[PDB]
Amino acid sequence: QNAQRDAVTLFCCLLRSRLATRRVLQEYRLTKQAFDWVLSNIEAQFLRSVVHPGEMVGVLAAQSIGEPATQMKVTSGVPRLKEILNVAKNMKTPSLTVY
Amino acid sequence: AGRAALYKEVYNVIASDGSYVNYRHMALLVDVMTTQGGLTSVTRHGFNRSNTGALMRCSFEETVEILFEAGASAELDDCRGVSENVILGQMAPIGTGAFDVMIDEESLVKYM
Amino acid sequence: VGQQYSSAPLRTVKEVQFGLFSPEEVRAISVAKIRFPETMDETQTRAKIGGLNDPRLGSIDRNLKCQTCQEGMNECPGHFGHIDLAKPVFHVGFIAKIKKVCECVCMHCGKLLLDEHNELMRQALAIKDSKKRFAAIWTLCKTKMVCETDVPSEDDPTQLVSRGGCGNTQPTIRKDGLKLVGSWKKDPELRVLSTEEILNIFKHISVKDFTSLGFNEVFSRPEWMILTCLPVPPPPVRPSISFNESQRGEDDLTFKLADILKANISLETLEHNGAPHHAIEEAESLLQFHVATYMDNDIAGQPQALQKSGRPVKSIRARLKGKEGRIRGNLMGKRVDFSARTVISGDPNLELDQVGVPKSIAKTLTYPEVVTPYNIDRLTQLVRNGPNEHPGAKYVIRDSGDRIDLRYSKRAGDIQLQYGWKVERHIMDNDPVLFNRQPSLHKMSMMAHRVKVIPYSTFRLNLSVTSPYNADFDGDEMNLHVPQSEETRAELSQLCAVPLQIVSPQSNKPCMGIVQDTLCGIRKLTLRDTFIELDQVLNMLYWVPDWDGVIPTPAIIKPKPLWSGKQILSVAIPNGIHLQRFDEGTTLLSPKDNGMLIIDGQIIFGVVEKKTVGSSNGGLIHVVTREKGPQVCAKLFGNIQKVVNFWLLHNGFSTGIGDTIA
Amino acid sequence: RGPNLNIVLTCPECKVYPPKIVERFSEGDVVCALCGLVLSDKLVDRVGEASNPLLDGNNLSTRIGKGETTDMRFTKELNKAQGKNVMDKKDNEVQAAFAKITMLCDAAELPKIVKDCAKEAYKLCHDEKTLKGKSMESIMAASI
Amino acid sequence: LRFGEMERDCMIAHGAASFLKERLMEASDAFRVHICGICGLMTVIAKLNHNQFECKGCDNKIDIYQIHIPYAAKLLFQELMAMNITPRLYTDRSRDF
Amino acid sequence: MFFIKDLSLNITLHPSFFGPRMKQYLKTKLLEEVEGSCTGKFGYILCVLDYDNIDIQRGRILPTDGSAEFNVKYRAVVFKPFKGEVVDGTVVSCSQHGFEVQVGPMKVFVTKHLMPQDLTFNAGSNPPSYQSSEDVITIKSRIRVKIEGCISQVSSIHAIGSIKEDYLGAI
Amino acid sequence: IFVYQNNITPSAMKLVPSIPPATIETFNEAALVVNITHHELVPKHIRLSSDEKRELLKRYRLKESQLPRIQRADPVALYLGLKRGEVVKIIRKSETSGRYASYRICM
Amino acid sequence: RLVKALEDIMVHYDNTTRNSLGNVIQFIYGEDGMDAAHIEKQSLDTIGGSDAAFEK
Amino acid sequence: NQEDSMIMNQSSIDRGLFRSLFFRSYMDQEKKYGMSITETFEKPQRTNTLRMKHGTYDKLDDDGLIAPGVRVSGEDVIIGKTTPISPDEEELGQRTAYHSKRDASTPLRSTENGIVDQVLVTTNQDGLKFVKVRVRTTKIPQIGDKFASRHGQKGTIGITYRREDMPFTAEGIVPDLIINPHAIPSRMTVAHLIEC
Amino acid sequence: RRRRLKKVEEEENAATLQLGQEFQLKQINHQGEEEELIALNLSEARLVIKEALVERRRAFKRSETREKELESIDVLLEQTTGGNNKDLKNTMQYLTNFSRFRDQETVGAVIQLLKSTGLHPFEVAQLGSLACDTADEAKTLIPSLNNKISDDELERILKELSNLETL
């Protein structure tokens, strides 16, 4: 339950930001049946939006990262991605950002 | 902090040309690269050294050497990976095959 | 004909245990012994008994049965042989590993140099995995050059306890090509270490010694690395090709096995009939080289085995590693049946989830639909139609597994279909097929379409799906795969279907969109200037298949009844879709007429461009597919493409040289 | 005599011997031309080296040559080891004779049919009791 | 047609498992081979007409199973057996997950 | 000899029998291929006890066939022979190779190398049988045989018997 | 904790392992000028009890080897003085969940 | 290379993102238990604006 | 015409626009393997030849070579070659003492057809007989044939319209070929416009 | 677990109480607990089969002179059993052709005199199976009775058994 609240705290923050008392009663101007339908629809969409277990998210992530590399001072792009995935003690443009 | 810097660097590479990728794929990549306490490279001597079974380690590169090092050490392959079931042709434990279906009897007699 | 019934239980492989072969198990599971390097008989027409192509090991001819299992080609798995080597040889893929064991155990009494009386040994034994523990033991025992028969006590270094071991100094062992040599410590004498000495040392190694080294006591002992009984792969591993159905050219493994038999016979004759030690060493080196090049031709610092034609011998490692090996070329990626491939052309009058399949491809590809009471008449009619005219059928599989080809069967009369039989019919309309464009870098390019049979020679598909496929019709080809069961077809239609994949999990924006000139025409349809007359409005409303049937009231009532383009395009958009977007300087009044406002399934203001129907988040496509569903969004794709294509057909669009001059 | 090990493609329904058999190579089946029942499916229609066992017999040997990274001493040792092989001395001498016949015909710029016929004549006319005392040059000239 | 590596990976991404199984079994090579219960090897002499199975090296006629594997996998296992490496195939688990 | 054992069978029920009364169909299919079936693991399974309750688990739908694989656990009486066990029987057939004696479900062969030399075969008499100076062995005659060895296939068990041991033969 | 100035001799290093449960930890002055936890990249670390670790392994139905790992040479690990066999819970900032909780076992 | 490295990872029924051995990569997928296909870009109104704007 | 496709006038195709001749040559030789192991040009027959192909053999002549001008179809044999084998075998069921020869013919491609144009008999350096058969066919431009500009503007035929459907100017000139406008400025191909 | 492989073991022998890797003294029930191996003689197994058949008769219904009992069990077998029932008929014919005990009372008497011997179920089942009358014959028929049981004890057990049979 602690991990579940930890997972949904950002969406709960968004829900409280949008469905506040002042914004509903002043800007949004819904009615009681409309508000209940909104609560039911938000609950239904969030329940249908959970990641379906058994989904092979690893190969999907690998494809979703490998595809934008195809479409394209310090080095960037394909050689920098090569230097990232193949971790090397030296790189083309070693840089430091001191604040 | 190494994982955070890795995620920031990969994000910089991805969005250098303006292409955008969702966070969760990047998080999965950097978490796999930092799941062993060190920056495990995606090379032949990186992720292919973990004892995840001989067949997935030999599917990527150096098949014969991995099969030698498995046969000397007598590694027991659990056959839960994707490539093991692909080689053996049986249904992989992914997607529709990530569960099993039985037939019910209480509901079946309950309907009629 | 299928495969004949067996009484064995049908199980799935749950675990795979690797290891090594003991010589006893090789001699036990073998069905024959190889004695002659020749393959053919003296009459050059039958398989030689005791040769490399003994019928007990298997067969590679369709008319020949196996001598052991008494079965044909499709059932025989092939049976292994054994060669009893005169002298033991080292396995080429373990020599350095053997060298590591040569730096771990003693070379005289076959025991570990340092036992548990050392703290470093005790902390090295605490390593759980086999590889790191063996590496630590090898790196820590390589500097120990004495057997250590007597060691100081662990609890206190005041008394000396005599542990196991002979106390002889361990010589430095180094590899020379395919052999191992050792130099003793000068108080240096260098000599070649014989393989049988290493085998005897490995046999002298106790169970706990290689258990600490990580070798399993049941499946992989170190002593089983020393090859003294060579397994012989069956003829299905090493087939004989035919060039014009008369030549009997053998595989490279047959050549290597013949060379191994020749070397073994030469070594046996030299041992029995007497030879100098130079000849014995040369013969055993030749046998070791033949075994090594049979196992791995690519050895650094070693010449390779060459064929008569001058090409290198394609060894086991070369057949296993690389791209076109067994693993990467026959297991991970393999040629499949029930597939097609041809060039592509766009067809804007097809639906989004529909692909146009040629009629010859439909006649060739087959799908087995079983005979049910629900489709007895349709399948009977398809059987009676024959394999010549689409729609038709090509095979009828009865319940015993026997299959009737429908050609060469019409003269025998029609076959009455019973329940449970299969009919391999042609692929008809609304048959889901997976559709592919290589390289297929992402999952949006492996997508399940519905067959529409078209009378030409190209795959035809909707123009919207050319963006996830990364396809343009400049000669590109795509592939089609047909499912072969109800489960497979059902999961293909319910998982990989075109409408289900409009939003891409790559970047949570719709990967498909109204693109190319249908994107251009929709800009010229919904301008402020564009008004459409009655005779064109009626056809633009009729082109929508899910048109609600009521004529929209014109935005220009009189002096002339004229509809605006936004009003006509709003018929393609289903009701209940509301979208709001503002560009720079965009208000509720719109002088530039940028932005976009869609209220109650009607376009209020704003031209439709790449920011509204294109492959971008916050557009019409994303809103419709997340509020109404995938099917409604696919129908939206079809309706908008139909309306915009018809309007640009009757309106026209061009570009020219004068468009590029100021 | 001996094991049969023969497979006959007989249709089990027509019971007509010999049956009319059609080998559909394109669709990869063996079918009965009377009833259309298949007999054997998944039929097999490069990877090795051509060797006709009529020109030189059932000789199966490979030489040793230089690879990508090759030590010369190991190659010399392996060539000397292959030299002192006593079982294939007859095969080695008939291969040397074939090499001399093809060189001597090839310096005569005669077609390949002459070399093939001379080689097969030398092979089928070797190891004969009535032909042992003649010099090898006469044997080669007669074969040519 | 080449149902290559990347096509297989995209099929993994879709979660279609029976499609992958029938591209890897029924569309190319569905080979039925018998294995022993004691040893995991496929060196089982199977006279199916006599309905008799006999495994050399174990001398058992009562503990033989049948499995469906691709012929490429069977060839890989047999050549590995020629490599003095034993890919023993067992039909039951031995260790907890 | 006769034992009472606990066995498990994997039954592939077809989807065609997926009716509301599928338990009766499963039970009938179980007793079709168990009664009289020979198994080298457990001997000849003859009859099934405890019919009022048979432990039927949850049936597994096969991943490519759709048929339900049930693991039915039952209790049954079996006849598993062992070498070194002496059994009575009756001779059902005879030949110059020897005679087949029926014990329970099994045809044990006593070969011509495994009787004492007094017994000789004759085919002139009807039926062709064995006779000695003290006893005869004919069809449907009581005898006692010692099982020297038995071979067990997956679906057939054959045993070799002898009568050379004293205090054997006809009772 | 012993904080030296320049270096440690190997002869003193080999006696750093001492009688348990007493432990010896050595840190350099130059390697400890700046608190690494005050950096933005390092998230919050909390060392868990044995009861909490057992509850974590029981509720997520894991094993000792199925958790993500942290090596016993990381500067945060030396900052918390971690040993083998204990799990630290890591609270970090997430751009899709605000706060995220992970667990790493020190190996 | 990336596909082979991330080949065996799948979200199980406990909403943990694990590989073939059962090793945890993430304790919940994407740190939120969320499919990528149902993600839209949304603005957080509270983080923007001033304190007076927040009070209004 | 989208994604670089082109709309082609079907009437222009019917009048010979880009219609072409396609010549494919097949080479077939004999060789002598020894005394009697040889192969021969003759028309095979069902009575005494093994492993006959299912294609029709009536197109041949007495010497086993098809006369020029004869129409050929899918996988129909154009060169008939036979070779002797060992008699009195037992294989495939249909083996007897009659089948003293087996077929070594070279059939046509399973999709290619056309008209045999020229059959040429000669001898190579070896003096052995070898033949060359040239099959000539038409390649009508249909949907899928790739057409190119002189500026890299390649593309297949999308569809073919007849004249009464395809647009026309006031002078009656119906174009031969309609190309997509969007292919011009993305590629910055101006020389196509200036060439036109 | 167990490193299963074809290890070294003796061959199956009924004289040395080696009945196989599965036919052990302690068997595992479906409930999971261990039980003694249930071995039967000829008469006891004939009873167990007969009440099994009449129990199947009772289950299906709700939804002395040798020849009359033979025709009764024949009609019972032909109405109860389905296909492939020749083997059960032939072995039950074997049982009734070699049965020595008719009712359950004498079978219970045999099992209660044989349970006090403290022997394996193998030997008590064989002693209930073999129609023996001599101690030396029992020694030469069952080799495991050597150095296991007294000769006079065998004599009184066999004479009580020989008293027990009727018809």
Place this chain on the structure above:
Amino acid sequence: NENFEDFDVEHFSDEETYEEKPQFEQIRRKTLKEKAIPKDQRATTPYMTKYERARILGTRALQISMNAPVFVDLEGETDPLRIAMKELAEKKIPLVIRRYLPDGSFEDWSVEELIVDL
């Protein structure tokens, strides 16, 4: 063969690039009955996943294909997939799903009680 300048990438052919760069428990144990989690502490989602839905339609379509007794009243539908969709729509399908946990334990779920929202 052919000679074409139409550049066609060889696919699954990364080994060229590979050769370019080669140088750089507590709760459940054994097979006891603690694997079968009873209904009162099922920790899985009561919503049927799209993969579970896909295999349920596939398996029911295959059973109806092999002539299983259909539990719903058809309106003349013939395709097995649509009949399976109709059966799951009004919950007359008598199949159950074993949601497998990573540790080997499993939870049973009747599709009658599974909420079908997609």
